[PDB]
Paper text:
DNA polymerase μ incorporates nucleotides in the non-homologous end-joining (NHEJ) pathway of double-strand break (DSB) repair. Error-prone synthesis by pol μ often introduces mismatches, as well as short deletions or insertions, at repaired sites. Pol μ is expected to frequently encounter oxidized nucleotides in its biological roles. We employed time-lapse X-ray crystallography to obtain snapshots of 8-oxodGTP insertion by pol μ on a model DSB substrate.
Numbering used by the authors: 138 to 364, 384 to 397, 410 to 494
The structure:
Amino acid sequence: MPAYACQRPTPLTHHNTGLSEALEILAEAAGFEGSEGRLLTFCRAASVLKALPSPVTTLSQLQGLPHFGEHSSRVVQELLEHGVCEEVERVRRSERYQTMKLFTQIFGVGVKTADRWYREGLRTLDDLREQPQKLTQQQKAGLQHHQDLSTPVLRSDVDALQQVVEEAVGQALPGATVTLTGGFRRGKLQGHDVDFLITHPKEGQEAGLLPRVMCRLQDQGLILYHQAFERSFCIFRLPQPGSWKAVRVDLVVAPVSQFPFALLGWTGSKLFQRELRRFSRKEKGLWLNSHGLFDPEQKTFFQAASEEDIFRHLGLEYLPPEQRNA
DNA sequence: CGGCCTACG
DNA sequence: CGTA
DNA sequence: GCCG
Ligand SMILES: Nc1nc2c(ncn2[C@H]2C[C@H](O)[C@@H](COP(=O)(O)OP(=O)(O)OP(=O)(O)O)O2)c(=O)[nH]1
Ligand SMILES: [Ca+2]
Ligand SMILES: [Ca+2]
Ligand SMILES: [Cl-]
Ligand code: NA
Ligand code: NA
């Protein structure tokens, strides 16, 4: 089993779901305390289990697996022997974990803001609503829409939404295209938000496009919240039987020269892309982001026409999106 | 021990 | 600071 | 928390 997640296929569904979900609780709790290193180790250990071909049934089967040291191994052992890990359950019911999770789920609130509110004594959404001068415009929108935004977006919702975006994009710039990215491109049947990548086949024509798209969506009454730019993090009105619901939608524009890098980055998963960028820099000496792949010794950018090109540049076997669920 | 992804709004 |  |  290789040490980087980008070196192994990771399917969406697998054979160690309960074990991985426990390690991801500990990863999340580490993030809430500001230890990104521990978060990464727990995430990586969880992802190793997702990549295995069958269930872990005995502690012996962790020997030699990367990212399983004394702590992650003890978590798995307790789950194998008792069906529960006391450390995980203590985290689950802790006031700190529950409130930090509640607050960071608000659009416009990160770990740093949630922690400050926690230290001030706040614990509930109604606590926040009773002091709204304390809130940015973004946070106000995230709090007002929190209930709808907490409900998963169904893959069955997405095609009708993509059609609406395509209509606005085609008026803004005929010939421009819309590609579904994010977890839905990896095969998920639900998601917390929808991610779209927009480009045009003629290099340079995409300049200035996103403000034109947003203006047209707003004029159609579809934008509940937004605001030169190339990424937009929106709240959209999605139809429902007899009504509608708020949904988070991300829009990104890339020039066609960069489209394979943007498609790769925005298709994720988040851990897969962090691991891929870490691999590129530490193992290959190349710097990767959603715009390109840079050789800092030649001071040259790799041209890519496809995601396949990028995997080849990096010396990695190609993984389709459905196998990037690290 | 150092390092832990890398951007844009 | 927020966001992907 | 773990790798190298
Ligand atoms: N490099 C990098 N990419 C990120 C980061 N956060 C998100 N992304 C990329 C990869 C994600 O798959 C993609 C979309 O992010 P989302 O939060 O929408 O996640 P995703 O669609 O995978 O899942 P979800 O909507 O929760 O089902 O953006 C980050 O911190 N770093
Ligand atoms: Ca998103
Ligand atoms: Ca998403
Ligand atoms: Cl840490
Ligand atoms: Na080990
Ligand atoms: Na948030």
